[PDB]
Design a protein around this ligand. Structure first.
Ligand code: MG
Length: 1000
């Protein structure tokens, strides 16, 4: 991993290299065979609460500190180590199997003796790889040759940069003109490529041909590249591989997989630190009552060993079992089918999410644009009134051979059918060959191709209404009428869309009539003054924009012949001149853009995924702030944000202007600060300046917005936003995405959720949790995350309370017997209470729910209570500490008072009291009873009875079987469980929880 260097890549010669290149393998594994065991062990024992029981078990190797048999502390430790190793290994094997599917995709490779199939993982730098239509590009390549006659290809890059526009790509000019694809190996040529980097949108390189009579050299840009993760829209392309594996542009925009620890586990770690300090103090006090007799330091260590008992190990065992249960429940849920849990150790993170950072393309939307509204001023046609438009077109073209509303509809539809840059592409379907279909205009074989998906949606709608674009060229268009006739239009001038002009125009001549028409189409901001005076463009454009529609204004100018020649002369003259050609050309173009007849407004929607709006409403009502981070353009992002109700219909939107330096950023931040309840829409270029100079101020202003949209955001910028939110808020973040540009922020977040993309899987493979639909997020957070958090809290508090009750009982036991370090419990009792005695009543707890799932979904305000840290805090910890001390004191001192023999049977008395006490605990803590709770408690009681009968070392069964013993132990337990009844009464009434009464 040294300095990246530029490379010379010979075409078809992977061996002609001066460096070993990485294998073309995508890897999401945290470890390999060598680092697995050290990595897992260090990630476990670098925290205090694992090293705690490690050292407790290790100190038993010293006989002076020995409190019993060696296995008493190593059978539970062996169980813990086996569980963690097996869990990590299973996760690693699942990751490997899931990466094998992407790495084993098959491609064709150009070889000297013919094309040879190659797996994606065996592709080397210098290979000539063939990628078919709708197939993912497996490695970074230079476009060399395409089978399509136009000598170009379209790429879908939404998995690479989240952009909905299709990218036009051009092959190397020399290689495209070769007679055959086999000629690539017959020429001496190489590509001089730059060093690998994270720049997805810029490439510098040179193509050289050496065997040519004149030395052929050609400059390369991003227009000649096919990066891995892009999809070929049409035709089979041939490329030469430049980068593979970890040097891929998409891979270099990702970080290494890391082990994530939840915030709940860190809180339990802090609790264990506090408990250890407290027990250290207690041991210092307890050996002081010995008057430091003998080896006082050995006494300190022995008392620390006794008072810890099962505090760290039982916590670990029960928390691990609970996390297994939570992941099992999530994976089996049929209301969020297909959910995959990769990070099984952090399901409680989903219960405490404050910021949701979401992707746009492919995550909120289906990446399928559709025509929605045709507005003609007096009449507007929606999805339910398209038969009216079809009837108008049909009547026009029927009465043609055998103003009115039909004429206006026809004018609008023809303008939509003509003013675009969409090309029909015909492909053979077996029955009809492409040449046959391209001449007969076969409907089933036709596909519409353009850079803009909005234009493709418009052309598809126009076909569905009666006018079909059936052929195109650089100088001609063909339309098919409902009477099956063909109308030919000569394209005289074309004014392609630019993101600066925000409009597109075309001049055509109708060969049937000879009339010359100038059509223009663009945004309302630039087309409000280009069209003639009206009274509805602004209002209806605003209404359509408020619904989340992409609005275009379509205008028309009928040109006389002399006018067209006069314009054409000046346009040619301005084009020929090289002295500021752009400005003169622009002036000549806008010489025509005036007093244009307004035809219609068009509305195209980027279709959201199912139940996106209710899910966003639920997340907002749960107290979660949602930010949209997208690589797509500003207009599309704003339209989708309004469509998905990320921004409320009446909400103010402040679009951050482009800033380039410190002063501009300061001025615009002030301008935004002067606003209230305003959503922020900012671009990545201005966001870069703001985070460079005013990170604190920008973060403080953005965290008080109702919603934030970051468009044209690079993967590193998304990760930076996630990291900055974590740093400056101290709260948890969830990143949701579907593409490779979302991997960095998914890894950066406290809880990564990856949506399974249509044409990519990297985000799902790299995420902690994988879902198939964005709507599953609502249930995954409100039900499973909330239950995981609350169950883990109750689990951990119960385990700590039991351990501290045992500790207080041991303290009283030692005090009774001259403050000696004699264990109260030893042998199988310690092992059982560490592992098996504890798993049953707390499995009963991991089955518990405070409310039903439907109630949790219906009332998201239950989530905001968890966002306050209510389930576990220092408050509840202190109350449980006091309760444990009270119960241990009550049990020990009641045994002292009631049993005539002081402490000879104290082990049996305390064991029976603890058994009945935990039965009363589980009976009084559970809120929604489950039959498996009864089964588990029956199993626990069976285990307790089996231990009582078979443990003759410290239990005398014939002493237990006595009415005197029975009533004494019953009274002790009833007195000890007073705080249980107090807490149960406070929960039942006189302080009702908010989750119970809200239903009715
Ligand atoms: Mg995406």
């Amino acid at each position: 991993g040294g300095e990246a260097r530029p490379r010379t890549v010979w075409l078809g010669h992977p061996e002609k290299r001066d460096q070993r290149y990485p294998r073309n393998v995508i890897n999401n594994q945290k470890y390999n065979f060598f680092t697995f065991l050290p990595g897992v062990l260090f990630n476990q024992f670098k925290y205090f609460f694992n090293l705690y029981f490690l050292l407790l078990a290790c100190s038993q190797f010293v006989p002076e500190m020995r409190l019993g048999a060696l296995y008493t502390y190593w059978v539970p430790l062996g169980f813990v180590l086996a569980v963690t190793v097996i869990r990590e290994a299973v996760e690693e094997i699942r990751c490997y199997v899931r990466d094998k599917e992407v790495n084993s995709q098959v491609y064709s490779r150009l070889t000297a003796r013919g094309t040879v199939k190659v797996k994606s993982s065996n592709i080397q730098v210098g290979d000539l790889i063939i990628v078919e239509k709708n197939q993912r590009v497996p490695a970074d390549m230079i476009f060399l040759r395409t089978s399509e006659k136009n000598g170009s290809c379209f790429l879908r890059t939404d998995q690479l940069d989240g952009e909905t526009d299709w990218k036009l790509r051009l092959p190397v000019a020399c290689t495209q003109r070769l007679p055959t694809a086999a000629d690539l190996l017959q020429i001496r040529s190489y590509v001089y490529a730059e060093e690998p980097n994270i720049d997805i949108h810029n490439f510098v390189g040179t193509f050289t041909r050496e065997d040519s009579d004149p030395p052929i050299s050609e400059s390369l840009s991003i227009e000649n590249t096919l990066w891995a993760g892009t999809v070929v829209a049409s035709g089979t392309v041939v490329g030469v591989v430049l980068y593979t594996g970890r040097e891929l542009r998409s891979v270099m925009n990702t970080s290494n997989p890391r082990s994530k620890i939840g915030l709940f586990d860190l809180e339990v770690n802090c609790l264990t630190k506090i408990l250890f300090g407290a027990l250290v103090v207690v041991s210092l006090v307890m050996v002081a009552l010995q008057h430091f007799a003998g080896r006082w330091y050995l006494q300190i260590i022995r008392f620390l060993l006794l008072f810890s008992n099962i505090i760290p190990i039982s916590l670990r065992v029960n928390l691990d079992m609970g996390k297994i249960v939570y992941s099992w429940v999530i994976r089996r849920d049929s209301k969020i089918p297909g959910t995959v849990v990769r990070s099984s150790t952090i399901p409680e993170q989903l219960g405490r999410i404050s910021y949701l950072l979401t992707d746009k393309t492919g995550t909120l939307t289906q990446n399928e644009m559709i025509f929605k509204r045709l507005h003609l001023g007096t009449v507007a046609y929606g999805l339910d009134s398209m038969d009216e438009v079809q009837s108008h077109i049909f009547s026009i073209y029927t009465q043609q051979s055998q103003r009115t509303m039909s004429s206006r509809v026809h004018e609008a539809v023809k303008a939509i059918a003509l003013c675009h840059n969409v090309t029909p592409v015909y492909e053979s379907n077996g029955v009809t060959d492409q040449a046959e279909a391209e001449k007969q205009y076969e409907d089933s074989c036709r596909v519409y191709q353009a850079s803009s998906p909005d234009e493709v949606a418009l052309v598809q709608w126009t076909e569905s209404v009666g006018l079909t674009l059936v052929g195109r060229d650089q100088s001609s268009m063909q339309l098919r009428t409902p009477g099956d006739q063909i109308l030919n239009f000569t394209i005289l001038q074309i004014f392609p869309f630019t993101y600066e002009s925000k409009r597109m125009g075309i001049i055509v001549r109708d060969e049937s009539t000879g009339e010359i028409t100038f059509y223009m189409k663009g945004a309302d901001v630039v087309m409000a003054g280009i069209v003639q005076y009206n009274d509805w463009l602004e209002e209806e454009c605003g209404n359509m924009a408020r619904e989340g529609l992409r609005v275009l204004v379509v205008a028309k100018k009928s040109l006389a012949e002399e006018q067209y020649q006069d314009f054409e002369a000046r346009y040619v003259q301005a084009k020929l001149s090289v002295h500021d050609r752009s400005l003169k050309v622009a002036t000549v173009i806008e010489s025509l853009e005036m007093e244009m007849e307004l035809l219609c407004l068009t509305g195209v929607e980027d279709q959201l995924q199912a139940d996106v709006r209710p899910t966003l409403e639920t997340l907002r009502n749960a107290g979660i702030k949602v930010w949209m981070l997208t690589g797509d353009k500003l207009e599309t992002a704003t339209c989708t944000a309004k469509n998905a109700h990320l921004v409320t219909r009446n909400q103010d939107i402040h679009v951050f202007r482009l800033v380039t330096n410190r002063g501009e950023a300061h001025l615009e931040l002030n301008a935004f600060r002067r606003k209230h309840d305003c959503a922020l829409v900012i671009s990545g270029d201005s966001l870069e300046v703001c985070l460079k100079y005013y990170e604190y101020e920008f973060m403080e202003l953005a965290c008080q917005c109702p919603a934030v949209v970051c468009c044209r955001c690079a993967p590193t910028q998304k990760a930076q936003i996630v990291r900055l939110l974590q740093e400056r808020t101290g709260k948890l973040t969830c990143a949701v995405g579907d593409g490779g540009n979302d991997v960095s922020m998914i890894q950066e977040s406290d809880c990564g959720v990856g949506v399974e993309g249509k044409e990519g899987k990297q985000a799902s493979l790299a995420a902690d949790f994988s879902i198939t639909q964005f709507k599953h997020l609502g249930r995954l957070l409100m039900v499973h995350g909330r239950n995981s958090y609350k169950r883990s809290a109750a689990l951990s508090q119960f385990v700590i309370h039991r351990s501290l009750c045992i500790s207080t009982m041991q303290a009283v036991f030692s005090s009774v017997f001259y403050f000696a370090s004699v264990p109260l419990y030893q042998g199988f009792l310690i092992i059982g209470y560490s592992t098996i005695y504890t798993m049953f009543p707390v499995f009963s707890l991991v089955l518990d729910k405070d409310v039903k799932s439907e109630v949790a979904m219906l009332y998201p305000e239950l989530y905001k209570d968890l966002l306050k840290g209510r389930p576990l805090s220092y408050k509840t910890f202190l109350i449980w500490v006091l309760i444990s001390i009270y119960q241990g004191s009550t049990i020990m001192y009641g045994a002292l008072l009631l049993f005539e023999s002081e402490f000879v049977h104290i082990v049996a008395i305390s064991f029976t009291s603890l058994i009945l006490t935990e039965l009363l605990m589980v009976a009084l803590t559970i809120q929604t009873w489950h039959w498996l709770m009864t089964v588990a408690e029956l199993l626990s009681l069976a285990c307790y009875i089996a231990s009582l009968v078979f443990l003759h070392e410290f239990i005398d069964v014939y002493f237990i079987a006595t009415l005197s013993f029975l009533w004494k132990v019953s009274v002790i337990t009833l007195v000890s469980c007073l705080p249980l009844y107090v807490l149960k009464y406070l929960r039942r009434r006189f302080s009702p929880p908010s989750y119970s009464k809200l239903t009715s």
